[PDB]
DNA sequence: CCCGTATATT
DNA sequence: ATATACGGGCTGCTGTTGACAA
């Protein structure tokens, strides 16, 4: 049985699904402290999740880390079965076990009397990159709101082909540009501000980003409530959000990104 | 950095060792500075897409950044998004000196579907008194007669002996690489036209070695196919099946499969000089070997057969 | 001379009549499960027991419903020899049904479903003063 | 060229720009020695629309003509015009800063090409017949007629009343016989069954514009034939809108 | 300085178009026509201009249009950043047919006649050309200014032209033509020497004028496009080039394949049969029948058919017949699987056209011609339409008599049973297989 | 490819 | 006495990957 794990708010796992769902597979990490979701793209773009088990009333492991590899699409639309808009009063249950090696992951849902049973057969494993960002080489750092760039990354659609990020100790201290069909479109944020918590950059750093690898944040950006964004020397992307659940607690979801 | 074949490529106009008519006639519009649109073909290896942006840099210069458009075949060439890219920069207005215009470049233009070919063929006509184009390619037949019917076709040929001697001696004197005349000659042989797989080979033969002596240059590898099977042609159109096993054999321990041999065998009987009987025949033969060939029974003795059959005719 | 085509479909003998559930919850049910196959299979059972059943080669899933009160049938001697356990499930293809479902925007009070074995399924609604009678064709 | 407008005009002079993109595919830029000019002309060349905006931001030109592609412009204010200031000049391109909460500023250059002077002719004191209603009656009545009609007719009836009707040229589609009463009318010099026949989309797009402040139409129609005229007039903006009659 | 000698000596009056007078007048004559007898009662109608690229189809028109002073409403297709391409296209033409201009500010004002010119088609009419056909008869029922359509084509690949109108809606919509012939050599000669001569006159510098052994050359190599041959002499002035790649027009090819144009055995070292094959000596050939295949852009599998068509007629004799028909027979077997078919075909029209070639003795002995070849038409292949026939017999005896084999063993039943039965639509086909004319 | 015919022009 | 155009014959008979309009 070597994992089993119960919860009755199917919603706070299905919008930490949800916030890092834009590939088709996925690979899970169970360990003493809870799991960890992984995904990555054109052995590039990484992001990882968190769920730790302060969120969990019954837990449940066996012996070592359990890993294997998930359809994502496929658990999630099994995760929200029941209808993604209930009145503020009713509850989702759901229970789940994966015993062992070579062997499907059950589903048990239930709500107000109505029973459901589902099994997800698991083909694992894949290999993860090594992408280290430990704060001790992070050269320019900044920490920022959510609803400034709502309209902001929203208008960044277009035909263009690369994204400029610019962030300089004067000037323009953190500029975005955008070179399409019709023009340039430069969305200056600067300091002093009601979402400007902290600026500590230190030297200017401009640099060139692929369009396609960069577009998904959207979906983290939307459920969010700040966020954190990180510079090293040789010019790697890392993006912290900070997502909250109706109870009132805190998950955290990180993206990597490399220059071009 | 970049090997031999990336790293000597001419910046000016007058250090491409190719035709001679053609180019001279670009340096002077280059002067002048009124190219219509053009379409150049031919063989790899010559320099079509260096001396297309030789003229772009000449013509432009400076201003070369916000007034040139290039495209190629990773690129997406569907209908929708490159008309419309296309259309923005004809219509986009520049300002520019005297005579120099806009350069649209769209390289191997060959593999663009015939959607995407009839929507340009509009834009070539209309804006000519800001814009002009220029198209390089390999196969002429694909690009369709339309597009052909306002365009100066310009056709390139296989490089000669004496340039690519020149050449290769300026950049030998550049390198300082102690030379042999016939590892020379024996590299031009293995070169067969086409110039960067020259440069190639002989970078490949000086990596270890020192020396371009010819039997350094042979055991570096590589060699030339053809002309082995030209000699057993031959030797068979005569009724000597004993010579004529004796190339194969060689060939074969060489280690070619046999569907490479069989097709180098056909395409160099097409254009050789004998009569019609004995052709049309050799055309029989060689195609139904072919189909056994490919059905999955290849071995020895088919082609072994194959001679048998071919020596029979003229008994 | 087409007026007798247009005449009240006939309803054959149920095999089984049931009470059927809330409509928005059968409906919300249906549409996720729409996303995974076209094959939807449903069965009745004698104590009120509806379940839908998708089987893929990669993922199987089927959602219960119990509790829903059988009405009194009027065949009340056919009854000693049939199990209570026994079903009359049948297969559908899920194009038709989600659009019935879909259409409807109040819950009525007499809601029935009659399910034979071979061939049929069939809807009884009434609401206000309207009713509605629904006939889906099996063997999807 | 300098403008720059402050306040709640951002809001109509997006609508106004929705309301000629609706109109036609291109916007032809020109500022006049009493302020702003918006032009725009159907491909066919049946329909003309034109907003003058008297002088009401900073109004200063000369430090002079441009035509612009209308979607740029159409997307740019509907994504961003919802916003305390705006600012346009020309550069030489076309900017269009635009100064937002805090200290957000978000620029947008545009290509722009060299394009001849576009007007027409039209004679309103020449025209005999003249009609003149508040646009929220009009906007009412045009609500029943379906989203894909083509052509509608105006008419004054037998009995100093108004009429609109669907024009059509065996699978026929509905037909509609909308009227209306003279006490809602402000204005009617008429006749005894003059109508005209014209199209629906800018006559949309004109009640769509007229349909913020309760503003008031003026429809100067003739003899079939010879355009008809819509002008709209308010306290510092002018719009005037030319259509053609079916013969 | 500015623009192409394309672009710089365009015709402005009508005397300077390079296009044979009748062909001009014949379109004159046609718009004049329509605009004097413009009846009020007149509706719509539909022309069309055909003919190879760079003869002038367009200027010609639009000169002819300002000479007569009439108004052109042309068609640009739309640039996008929901409504569909059709929609666009059917609005703009009932706006064209509809209503009129306004003012403007200067045009040519006294105007109350035009027509419509359409020329870039979008690419949703050459992928469906199902819509085409639905709008032309709207058209046709609601027209009232006559629309004209412009196409280029070229003699081999029209497969976008017989697409778009395949003989019945201009049958049954009542489209007249007119059809352009390339540029005769003596009116681009001396156009081109008008050209030169006025470069000529410029001076400015002593500039070498291209010689004279050289611009026929230009204008042998172009097959009568004037944009092409003004673009190469604009290249060749600056101090043979304009290749264009030629289509052969296939029925031009077959008879190419088909006549044999020989030599008269110019002394030469070529190997000759040594004792025994003294039958089999040919003269000398001047073609080269890879290139003839290729270059009329045809699959092979269809002008080997074309060759079992036309070939029977041109040869005299039984034994040439038999060796014919054997390398026929031995071109069609290299093609009978469905994995390796496209591996292995250009030996199939290879060896057919070889052998066809060959294989004709009686005419290939030189001067041994006189004479003959009167005006003969070739024709099509009839195979097609008894294939599609056998397969829509087979489904018809299938599905009735489904309780091949039924054709090839149950079919002889049928075709003796005779007898009647019960219903309808089946006595006739029963009649249908038995009934072969017999005395 | 193939044969014979009607019009512009010197 | 020599260059140029009419007349008559063509759209047609299993698998794996890719672009377009909605
Ligand atoms: N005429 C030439 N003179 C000198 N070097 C040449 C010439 N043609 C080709 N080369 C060499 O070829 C190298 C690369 O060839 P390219 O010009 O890129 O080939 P290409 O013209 O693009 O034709 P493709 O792309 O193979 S079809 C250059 O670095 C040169 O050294
Ligand atoms: N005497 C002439 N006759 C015709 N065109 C001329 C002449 N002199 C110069 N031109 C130029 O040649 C152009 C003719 O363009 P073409 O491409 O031949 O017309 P077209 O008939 O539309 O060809 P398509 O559409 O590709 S079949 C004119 O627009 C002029 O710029």
Same mark, same amino acid.
């Given at each position: 049985?070597?994992?089993?794990?119960?919860?009755?708010?199917?919603?706070?796992?299905?919008?930490?699904?949800?916030?890092?769902?834009?590939?088709?597979?996925?690979?899970?990490?169970?360990?003493?402290?809870?799991?960890?979701?992984?995904?990555?793209?054109?052995?590039?773009?990484?992001?990882?999740?968190?769920?730790?088990?302060?969120?969990?009333?019954?837990?449940?492991?066996?012996?070592?880390?359990?890993?294997?590899?998930?359809?994502?699409?496929?658990?999630?639309?099994?995760?929200?079965?029941?209808?993604?808009?209930?009145?503020?009063?009713?509850?989702?249950?759901?229970?789940?076990?994966?015993?062992?090696?070579?062997?499907?992951?059950?589903?048990?849902?239930?709500?107000?009397?109505?029973?459901?049973?589902?099994?997800?057969?698991?083909?694992?494993?894949?290999?993860?990159?090594?992408?280290?960002?430990?704060?001790?080489?992070?050269?320019?750092?900044?920490?920022?709101?959510?609803?400034?760039?709502?309209?902001?990354?929203?208008?960044?659609?277009?035909?263009?082909?690369?994204?400029?990020?610019?962030?300089?100790?004067?000037?323009?201290?953190?500029?975005?540009?955008?070179?399409?069909?019709?023009?340039?479109?430069?969305?200056?944020?600067?300091?002093?501000?009601?979402?400007?918590?902290?600026?500590?950059?230190?030297?200017?750093?401009?640099?060139?980003?692929?369009?396609?690898?960069?577009?998904?944040?959207?979906?983290?950006?939307?459920?969010?409530?700040?966020?954190?964004?990180?510079?090293?020397?040789?010019?790697?992307?890392?993006?912290?959000?900070?997502?909250?659940?109706?109870?009132?607690?805190?998950?955290?979801?990180?993206?990597?990104?490399?220059?071009? | 950095?970049?090997?031999?074949?990336?790293?000597?490529?001419?910046?000016?106009?007058?250090?491409?060792?190719?035709?001679?008519?053609?180019?001279?006639?670009?340096?002077?519009?280059?002067?002048?500075?009124?190219?219509?649109?053009?379409?150049?073909?031919?063989?790899?290896?010559?320099?079509?897409?260096?001396?297309?942006?030789?003229?772009?840099?000449?013509?432009?210069?400076?201003?070369?950044?916000?007034?040139?458009?290039?495209?190629?075949?990773?690129?997406?060439?569907?209908?929708?998004?490159?008309?419309?890219?296309?259309?923005?920069?004809?219509?986009?207005?520049?300002?520019?000196?005297?005579?120099?215009?806009?350069?649209?470049?769209?390289?191997?233009?060959?593999?663009?579907?015939?959607?995407?070919?009839?929507?340009?063929?509009?834009?070539?006509?209309?804006?000519?008194?800001?814009?002009?184009?220029?198209?390089?390619?390999?196969?002429?037949?694909?690009?369709?007669?339309?597009?052909?019917?306002?365009?100066?076709?310009?056709?390139?040929?296989?490089?000669?002996?004496?340039?690519?001697?020149?050449?290769?001696?300026?950049?030998?004197?550049?390198?300082?690489?102690?030379?042999?005349?016939?590892?020379?000659?024996?590299?031009?042989?293995?070169?067969?036209?086409?110039?960067?797989?020259?440069?190639?080979?002989?970078?490949?033969?000086?990596?270890?070695?020192?020396?371009?002596?010819?039997?350094?240059?042979?055991?570096?590898?590589?060699?030339?196919?053809?002309?082995?099977?030209?000699?057993?042609?031959?030797?068979?159109?005569?009724?000597?099946?004993?010579?004529?096993?004796?190339?194969?054999?060689?060939?074969?321990?060489?280690?070619?499969?046999?569907?490479?041999?069989?097709?180098?065998?056909?395409?160099?009987?097409?254009?050789?000089?004998?009569?019609?009987?004995?052709?049309?025949?050799?055309?029989?033969?060689?195609?139904?070997?072919?189909?056994?060939?490919?059905?999955?029974?290849?071995?020895?003795?088919?082609?072994?057969?194959?001679?048998?059959?071919?020596?029979?005719?003229?008994? | 001379?087409?007026?007798?085509?247009?005449?009240?479909?006939?309803?054959?003998?149920?095999?089984?009549?049931?009470?059927?559930?809330?409509?928005?919850?059968?409906?919300?049910?249906?549409?996720?499960?729409?996303?995974?196959?076209?094959?939807?299979?449903?069965?009745?059972?004698?104590?009120?027991?509806?379940?839908?059943?998708?089987?893929?080669?990669?993922?199987?899933?089927?959602?219960?419903?119990?509790?829903?009160?059988?009405?009194?049938?009027?065949?009340?001697?056919?009854?000693?020899?049939?199990?209570?356990?026994?079903?009359?499930?049948?297969?559908?293809?899920?194009?038709?049904?989600?659009?019935?479902?879909?259409?409807?925007?109040?819950?009525?009070?007499?809601?029935?479903?009659?399910?034979?074995?071979?061939?049929?399924?069939?809807?009884?609604?009434?609401?206000?003063?309207?009713?509605?009678?629904?006939?889906?064709?099996?063997?999807? | 060229?300098?403008?720059?407008?402050?306040?709640?005009?951002?809001?109509?002079?997006?609508?106004?720009?929705?309301?000629?993109?609706?109109?036609?595919?291109?916007?032809?830029?020109?500022?006049?020695?009493?302020?702003?000019?918006?032009?725009?002309?159907?491909?066919?060349?049946?329909?003309?629309?034109?907003?003058?905006?008297?002088?009401?931001?900073?109004?200063?030109?000369?430090?002079?003509?441009?035509?612009?592609?209308?979607?740029?412009?159409?997307?740019?204010?509907?994504?961003?015009?919802?916003?305390?200031?705006?600012?346009?000049?020309?550069?030489?391109?076309?900017?269009?800063?635009?100064?937002?909460?805090?200290?957000?500023?978000?620029?947008?250059?545009?290509?722009?090409?060299?394009?001849?002077?576009?007007?027409?002719?039209?004679?309103?004191?020449?025209?005999?017949?003249?009609?003149?209603?508040?646009?929220?009656?009009?906007?009412?009545?045009?609500?029943?007629?379906?989203?894909?009609?083509?052509?509608?007719?105006?008419?004054?009836?037998?009995?100093?009343?108004?009429?609109?009707?669907?024009?059509?040229?065996?699978?026929?589609?509905?037909?509609?016989?909308?009227?209306?009463?003279?006490?809602?009318?402000?204005?009617?010099?008429?006749?005894?069954?003059?109508?005209?026949?014209?199209?629906?989309?800018?006559?949309?797009?004109?009640?769509?514009?007229?349909?913020?402040?309760?503003?008031?139409?003026?429809?100067?129609?003739?003899?079939?034939?010879?355009?008809?005229?819509?002008?709209?007039?308010?306290?510092?903006?002018?719009?005037?809108?030319?259509?053609?009659?079916?013969? | 300085?500015?623009?192409?000698?394309?672009?710089?000596?365009?015709?402005?009056?009508?005397?300077?178009?390079?296009?044979?007078?009748?062909?001009?007048?014949?379109?004159?004559?046609?718009?004049?026509?329509?605009?004097?007898?413009?009846?009020?009662?007149?509706?719509?109608?539909?022309?069309?201009?055909?003919?190879?690229?760079?003869?002038?189809?367009?200027?010609?028109?639009?000169?002819?249009?300002?000479?007569?002073?009439?108004?052109?409403?042309?068609?640009?297709?739309?640039?996008?950043?929901?409504?569909?391409?059709?929609?666009?296209?059917?609005?703009?033409?009932?706006?064209?047919?509809?209503?009129?201009?306004?003012?403007?500010?200067?045009?040519?004002?006294?105007?109350?006649?035009?027509?419509?010119?359409?020329?870039?088609?979008?690419?949703?009419?050459?992928?469906? $050309?199902?819509? #085409?056909?639905?709008? *032309?008869? +709207?058209?046709?029922?609601?027209? &009232?200014?006559? %629309?004209?359509?412009?196409? =280029?084509?070229?003699?081999?690949?029209?497969?976008?032209?017989?697409?778009?109108?395949?003989?019945?809606?201009?049958?049954?919509?009542?489209?007249?033509?007119?059809?352009?012939?390339?540029?005769?050599?003596?009116?681009?000669?001396?156009?081109?020497?008008?050209?030169?001569?006025?470069?000529?006159?410029?001076?400015?510098?002593?500039?070498?004028?291209?010689?004279?052994?050289?611009?026929?050359?230009?204008?042998?190599?172009?097959?009568?496009?004037?944009?092409?041959?003004?673009?190469?002499?604009?290249?060749?002035?600056?101090?043979?080039?304009?290749?264009?790649?030629? $289509?052969?027009? #296939?029925?031009?090819? *077959?008879? +190419?394949?088909?006549?044999?144009? &020989?030599?008269? %055995?110019?002394?030469?070292? =070529?190997?000759?049969?040594?004792?025994?094959?003294?039958?089999?000596?040919?003269?000398?050939?001047?073609?080269?029948?890879?290139?003839?295949?290729?270059?009329?852009?045809?699959?092979?599998?269809?002008?080997?058919?074309?060759?079992?068509?036309?070939?029977?007629?041109?040869?005299?004799?039984?034994?040439?017949?038999?060796?014919?028909?054997?390398?026929?027979?031995?071109?069609?077997?290299?093609?009978?699987?469905?994995?390796?078919?496209?591996?292995?075909?250009?030996?199939?029209?290879?060896?057919?056209?070889?052998?066809?070639?060959?294989?004709?003795?009686?005419?290939?002995?030189?001067?041994?011609?006189?004479?003959?070849?009167?005006?003969?038409?070739?024709?099509?292949?009839?195979?097609?339409?008894?294939?599609?026939?056998?397969?829509?017999?087979?489904?018809?005896?299938?599905?009735?008599?489904?309780?091949?084999?039924?054709?090839?063993?149950?079919?002889?039943?049928?075709?003796?049973?005779?007898?009647?039965?019960?219903?309808?639509?089946?006595?006739?086909?029963?009649?249908?297989?038995?009934?072969?004319?017999?005395?």
């Amino acid at each position: 049985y070597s994992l089993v794990a119960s919860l009755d708010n199917v919603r706070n796992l299905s919008t930490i699904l949800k916030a890092i769902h834009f590939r088709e597979h996925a690979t899970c990490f169970a360990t003493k402290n809870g799991i960890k979701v992984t995904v990555e793209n054109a052995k590039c773009v990484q992001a990882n999740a968190f769920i730790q088990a302060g969120i969990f009333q019954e837990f449940k492991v066996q012996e070592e880390s359990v890993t294997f590899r998930i359809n994502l699409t496929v658990l999630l639309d099994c995760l929200s079965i029941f209808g993604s808009s209930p009145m503020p009063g009713t509850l989702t249950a759901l229970r789940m076990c994966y015993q062992g090696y070579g062997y499907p992951l059950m589903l048990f849902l239930e709500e107000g009397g109505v029973v459901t049973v589902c099994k997800i057969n698991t083909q694992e494993p894949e290999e993860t990159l090594d992408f280290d960002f430990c704060s001790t080489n992070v050269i320019n750092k900044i920490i920022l709101q959510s609803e400034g760039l709502r309209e902001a990354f929203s208008e960044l659609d277009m035909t263009s082909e690369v994204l400029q990020i610019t962030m300089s100790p004067d000037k323009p201290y953190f500029r975005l540009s955008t070179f399409g069909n019709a023009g340039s479109s430069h969305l200056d944020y600067p300091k002093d501000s009601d979402l400007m918590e902290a600026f500590h950059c230190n030297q200017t750093q401009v640099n060139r980003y692929k369009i396609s690898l960069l577009k998904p944040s959207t979906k983290a950006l939307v459920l969010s409530c700040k966020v954190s964004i990180r510079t090293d020397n040789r010019g790697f992307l890392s993006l912290q959000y900070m997502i909250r659940n109706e109870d009132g607690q805190i998950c955290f979801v990180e993206y990597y990104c490399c220059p071009d | 950095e970049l090997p031999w074949v990336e790293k000597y490529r001419p910046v000016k106009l007058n250090e491409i060792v190719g035709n001679e008519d053609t180019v001279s006639r670009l340096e002077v519009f280059a002067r002048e500075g009124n190219v219509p649109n053009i379409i150049i073909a031919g063989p790899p290896g010559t320099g079509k897409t260096t001396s297309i942006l030789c003229l772009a840099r000449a013509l432009l210069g400076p201003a070369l950044k916000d007034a040139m458009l290039e495209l190629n075949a990773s690129n997406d060439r569907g209908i929708d998004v490159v008309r419309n890219k296309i259309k923005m920069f004809a219509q986009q207005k520049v300002t520019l000196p005297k005579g120099r215009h806009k350069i649209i470049i769209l390289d191997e233009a060959d593999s663009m579907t015939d959607g995407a070919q009839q929507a340009l063929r509009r834009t070539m006509e209309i804006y000519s008194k800001t814009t002009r184009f220029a198209l390089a390619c390999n196969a002429s037949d694909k690009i369709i007669e339309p597009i052909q019917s306002r365009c100066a076709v310009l056709r390139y040929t296989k490089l000669t002996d004496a340039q690519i001697l020149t050449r290769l001696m300026n950049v030998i004197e550049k390198e300082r690489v102690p030379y042999t005349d016939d590892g020379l000659e024996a590299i031009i042989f293995t070169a067969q036209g086409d110039m960067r797989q020259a440069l190639n080979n002989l970078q490949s033969t000086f990596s270890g070695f020192g020396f371009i002596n010819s039997e350094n240059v042979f055991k570096v590898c590589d060699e030339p196919h053809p002309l082995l099977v030209k000699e057993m042609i031959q030797h068979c159109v005569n009724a000597n099946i004993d010579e004529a096993y004796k190339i194969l054999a060689h060939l074969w321990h060489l280690g070619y499969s046999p569907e490479d041999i069989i097709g180098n065998i056909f395409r160099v009987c097409k254009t050789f000089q004998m009569a019609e009987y004995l052709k049309l025949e050799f055309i029989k033969e060689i195609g139904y070997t072919h189909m056994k060939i490919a059905e999955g029974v290849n071995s020895l003795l088919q082609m072994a057969g194959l001679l048998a059959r071919l020596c029979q005719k003229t008994m | 001379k087409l007026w007798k085509d247009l005449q009240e479909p006939v309803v054959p003998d149920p095999d089984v009549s049931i009470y059927l559930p809330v409509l928005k919850t059968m409906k919300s049910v249906v549409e996720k499960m729409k996303n995974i196959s076209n094959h939807l299979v449903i069965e009745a059972n004698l104590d009120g027991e509806l379940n839908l059943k998708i089987e893929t080669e990669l993922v199987c899933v089927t959602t219960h419903f119990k509790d829903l009160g059988n009405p009194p049938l009027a065949s009340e001697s056919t009854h000693e020899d049939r199990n209570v356990e026994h079903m009359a499930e049948v297969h559908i293809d899920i194009r038709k049904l989600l659009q019935f479902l879909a259409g409807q925007q109040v819950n009525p009070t007499k809601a029935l479903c009659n399910i034979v074995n071979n061939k049929m399924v069939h809807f009884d609604l009434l609401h206000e003063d309207v009713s509605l009678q629904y006939f889906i064709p099996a063997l999807s | 060229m300098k403008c720059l407008v402050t306040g709640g005009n951002v809001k109509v002079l997006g609508k106004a720009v929705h309301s000629l993109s609706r109109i036609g595919d291109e916007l032809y830029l020109e500022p006049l020695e009493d302020g702003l000019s918006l032009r725009t002309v159907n491909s066919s060349r049946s329909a003309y629309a034109c907003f003058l905006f008297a002088p009401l931001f900073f109004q200063q030109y000369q430090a002079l003509r441009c035509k612009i592609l209308m979607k740029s412009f159409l997307s740019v204010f509907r994504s961003l015009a919802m916003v305390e200031k705006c600012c346009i000049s020309l550069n030489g391109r076309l900017v269009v800063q635009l100064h937002c909460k805090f200290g957000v500023r978000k620029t947008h250059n545009l290509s722009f090409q060299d394009c001849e002077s576009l007007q027409a002719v039209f004679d309103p004191a020449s025209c005999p017949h003249m009609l003149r209603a508040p646009a929220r009656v009009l906007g009412e009545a045009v609500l029943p007629f379906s989203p894909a009609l083509a052509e509608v007719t105006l008419g004054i009836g037998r009995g100093r009343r108004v009429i609109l009707r669907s024009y059509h040229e065996t699978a026929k589609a509905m037909v509609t016989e909308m009227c209306l009463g003279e006490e809602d009318f402000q204005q009617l010099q008429a006749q005894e069954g003059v109508a005209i026949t014209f199209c629906l989309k800018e006559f949309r797009g004109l009640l769509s514009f007229a349909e913020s402040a309760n503003l008031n139409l003026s429809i100067h129609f003739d003899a079939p034939g010879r355009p008809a005229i819509f002008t709209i007039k308010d306290s510092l903006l002018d719009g005037h809108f030319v259509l053609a009659t079916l013969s | 300085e500015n623009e192409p000698w394309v672009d710089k000596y365009k015709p402005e009056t009508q005397h300077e178009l390079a296009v044979h007078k009748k062909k001009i007048e014949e379109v004159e004559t046609w718009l004049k026509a329509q605009v004097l007898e413009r009846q009020p009662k007149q509706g719509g109608s539909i022309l069309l201009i055909t003919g190879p690229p760079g003869c002038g189809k367009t200027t010609t028109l639009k000169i002819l249009s300002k000479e007569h002073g009439i108004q052109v409403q042309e068609w640009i297709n739309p640039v996008l950043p929901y409504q569909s391409q059709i929609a666009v296209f059917k609005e703009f033409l009932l706006r064209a047919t509809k209503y009129n201009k306004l003012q403007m500010l200067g045009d040519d004002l006294r105007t109350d006649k035009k027509i419509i010119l359409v020329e870039d088609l979008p690419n949703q009419f050459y992928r469906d $050309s199902h819509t #085409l056909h639905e709008v *032309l008869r +709207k058209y046709v029922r609601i027209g &009232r200014c006559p %629309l004209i359509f412009i196409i =280029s084509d070229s003699l081999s690949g029209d497969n976008n032209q017989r697409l778009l109108f395949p003989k019945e809606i201009q049958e049954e919509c009542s489209i007249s033509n007119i059809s352009f012939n390339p540029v005769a050599p003596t009116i681009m000669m001396k156009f081109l020497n008008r050209i030169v001569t006025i470069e000529a006159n410029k001076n400015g510098g002593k500039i070498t004028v291209p010689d004279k052994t050289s611009l026929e050359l230009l204008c042998q190599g172009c097959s009568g496009d004037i944009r092409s041959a003004i673009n190469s002499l604009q290249f060749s002035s600056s101090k043979a080039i304009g290749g264009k790649d030629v $289509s052969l027009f #296939l029925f031009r090819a *077959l008879g +190419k394949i088909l006549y044999c144009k &020989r030599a008269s %055995l110019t002394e030469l070292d =070529s190997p000759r049969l040594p004792s025994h094959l003294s039958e089999y000596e040919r003269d000398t050939l001047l073609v080269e029948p890879e290139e003839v295949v290729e270059m009329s852009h045809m699959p092979g599998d269809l002008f080997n058919l074309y060759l079992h068509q036309n070939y029977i007629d041109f040869f005299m004799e039984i034994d040439d017949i038999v060796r014919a028909s054997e390398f026929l027979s031995f071109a069609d077997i290299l093609s009978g699987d469905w994995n390796t078919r496209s591996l292995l075909r250009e030996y199939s029209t290879s060896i057919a056209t070889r052998g066809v070639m060959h294989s004709n003795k009686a005419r290939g002995y030189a001067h041994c011609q006189g004479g003959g070849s009167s005006f003969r038409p070739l024709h099509k292949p009839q195979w097609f339409l008894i294939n599609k026939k056998y397969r829509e017999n087979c489904l018809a005896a299938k599905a009735l008599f489904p309780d091949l084999c039924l054709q090839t063993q149950l079919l002889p039943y049928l075709a003796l049973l005779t007898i009647p039965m019960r219903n309808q639509a089946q006595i006739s086909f029963i009649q249908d297989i038995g009934r072969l004319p017999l005395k």
